A paper describes a structure:
The best data were collected to 2.5 Å resolution from a crystal of approximately 0.3 × 0.05 × 0.05 mm in size on beamline ID23-1 at the ESRF. The crystal belonged to space group P212121, with unit-cell parameters a = 62, b = 103, c = 199 Å. A homology model of tetrameric cod haemoglobin (made for pre-crystallographic studies) was used as a template for structure determination using molecular replacement. Phaser was able to identify two tetramers in the asymmetric unit [Fig. 3(a)]. The two cod haemoglobin tetramers superimpose on each other with an r.m.s.d. of 0.51 Å. Differences in conformation are primarily located in the loop between residues 45–60 and the C-terminal loops. Eight heme groups could be located in the electron density. The heme iron appears to be pentacoordinated in all subunits. The side chains of the histidines in the α and β units have conformations similar to that observed for perch haemoglobin, with distances of about 4.0–4.4 and 2.1–2.3 Å between the histidinyl N∊2 atom and Fe for α-chain residues His60 and His89, respectively, and 4 and 2.1–2.4 Å for β-chain residues His64 and His93, respectively. Haemoglobins from cold-adapted species have been found to follow distinct autooxidation patterns. The small differences in the distances and the amount of difference density observed close to the heme iron may suggest different states of autooxidation. The cod haemoglobin structure presented in this work appears to have Ala at position 63 and Leu at position 56 in the β chains, instead of Lys or Met, which are more common in cod sequences.
Residue numbers in the entry:
A (entry chain D), B (entry chain B): 2 to 146
C (entry chain C), D (entry chain A): 2 to 143
Amino acid sequence: VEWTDSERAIITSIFSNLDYEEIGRKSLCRCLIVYPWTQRYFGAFGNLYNAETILANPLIAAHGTKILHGLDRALKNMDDIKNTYAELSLLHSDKLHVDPDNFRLLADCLTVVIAAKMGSAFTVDTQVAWQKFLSVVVSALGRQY
Amino acid sequence: VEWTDSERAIITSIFSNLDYEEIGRKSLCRCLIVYPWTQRYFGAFGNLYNAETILANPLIAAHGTKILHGLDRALKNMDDIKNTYAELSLLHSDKLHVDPDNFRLLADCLTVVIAAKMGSAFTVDTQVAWQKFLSVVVSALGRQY
Amino acid sequence: SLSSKQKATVKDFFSKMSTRSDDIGAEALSRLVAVYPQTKSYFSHWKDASPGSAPVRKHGITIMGGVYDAVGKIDDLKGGLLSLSELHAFMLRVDPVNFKLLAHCMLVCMSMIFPEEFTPQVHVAVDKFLAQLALALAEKYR
Amino acid sequence: SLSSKQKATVKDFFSKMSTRSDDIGAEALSRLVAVYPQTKSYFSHWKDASPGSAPVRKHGITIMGGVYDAVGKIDDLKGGLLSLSELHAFMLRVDPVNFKLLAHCMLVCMSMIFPEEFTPQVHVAVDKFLAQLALALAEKYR
Ligand code: HEM
Ligand code: HEM
Ligand code: HEM
Ligand code: HEM
């Protein structure tokens, strides 16, 4: 889509309240517990046996940060979101065959971690812009036709 | 997307054998019967009281046809499918409001109509090709980013 | 389907957010309509959408009223919300996908207002509740 | 949820498919594995996913066993499919988004094999059956 110029201000505002070292880990911790079939896709990570294992597992935290760092890249390449994620698309959708609906799940969990942190500062129009940014990335991560 | 030569051969064969009036009528009728919330967008198309009425409704069967010709604009232009459907995409999502997932629901129903008419000639290989075609068509008809 | 533990988690969390019930509902319906702009077509017959606009604020209170009623009948949702399904699924033919979006919204408001309480465990129980409620409403589609 | 007229449509449609059980499942399964390659991960212990493959044919029949069972248990699919849910939803952790990929291919095989008899009406009722069947199997995720 065409960005409005408060859509950008509102997106960088949100991203400016995300410490990826804390948020990355918790967004993924939370997706693995709330949507536990997502655990299968991360066979390498070891024990995901329970919530205590999810939250104590160094490979989950570290990946949370990779994933959240990846999500944050379009902020710097915002009129080229598609080509920014074209390799990640091929990795998730062509190689690992992650169903696209799982992208919505992680991102929904992320927003929920953000809303906890920002409080009402996170307004309804801030969130709309935020969701426009997530729907563009997710759309870029899906199988490209 | 890269079409192979066999895929192109298979897609143009599927169409060649189809009565657009009879595929249209049956597909849309099935969509509205199988997925009755889609009737929300067709209130001005006479009485939609039950399966039989809908199956006997002439302006449904006329709109059916208009979908199968819509699909021809992609048969005829298989490498410019996004841009061919851009005027439509605008029309569907904004002047009519339809969510992305209803385009899948009708594609599922077109596939079932064509599976029935083509009988045994709807091979695995044919289904793979048809499906790729529909995935692209359906991806072009939804919102863009 | 909720385990008995999970139902207790939901009865206990919904009780803890009672005093902020209205504000959660209004935030939720307001965010639904701002964040997912296709949903306004369902409300086009009103004379408003988005926060401040009291019609959205009082329809949000009604939704939460229905939500608090579903909690009270959390052991038979299909049988107990048959009238509301008739209205949403049969009368209005609300597209099923709009329920997952409303639920998400309600989830971010709950987290927004009760961040320390809204743990992954509460999130699971409530998420599951909202889906089950969506599915009780889905009973009269077809 | 399934109405009487739905259950009846399903029961009397399943009657046709008694003989063809081996053939239908295998074909549907072959078609899911080919058209929707995200599904292949769950069968990576098979050396062949073609039709004709020894495991595709053994598992096709097995799938229709489970489908007959489910026709048996149409009144309480949630109670009824607990062992299969535990298998899919918990042990195997099948992404629930896959269920409709199988379900779709069964409806394609039922349309090729029973055109003109596989009406929109029958499609309503069979789709409703398979959608509940997936909900049933989804019980043990979380
Ligand atoms: C907004 C959503 C997502 C973003 C931005 C994202 C981003 C990334 C990034 C940046 C990588 C590193 C790979 C590379 O360097 O190219 C990656 C790997 C991966 N992602 Fe995602 N991802 C997302 C969603 C998902 C989801 C929902 C799943 C599964 C449920 C998934 C499964 C994986 C897997 C399995 C890998 C490889 C992990 C490994 O073995 O090292 N991703 N992702
Ligand atoms: C492959 C999928 C589809 C194709 C190719 C298609 C094609 C078309 C075409 C060509 C028109 C005529 C617009 C014009 O005259 O300029 C149209 C109109 C329309 N379509 Fe679709 N469509 C598709 C899916 C859907 C779905 C899924 C729905 C609803 C659930 C829908 C609802 C409508 C409506 C309401 C109109 C307006 C008709 C009128 O005012 O007479 N379409 N479509
Ligand atoms: C958990 C989810 C939901 C609950 C508990 C809920 C509850 C309610 C309730 C209690 C009413 C008032 C019924 C009455 O008149 O007695 C209602 C009306 C309505 N709901 Fe919902 N609802 C939900 C989701 C949705 C969604 C997702 C939509 C649309 C996107 C929707 C659209 C409407 C509309 C249009 C009305 C009628 C408004 C009017 O009177 O003008 N609802 N809902
Ligand atoms: C209507 C939907 C489905 C039904 C009725 C069904 C039924 C069954 C049945 C009866 C079994 C054997 C049970 C046993 O050994 O105790 C089974 C096994 C299995 N199912 Fe399904 N299933 C369905 C969908 C799916 C889907 C969509 C997938 C994957 C995409 C899947 C993957 C499997 C796997 C991997 C096994 C184990 C196979 C093995 O022994 O190697 N199933 N299913």
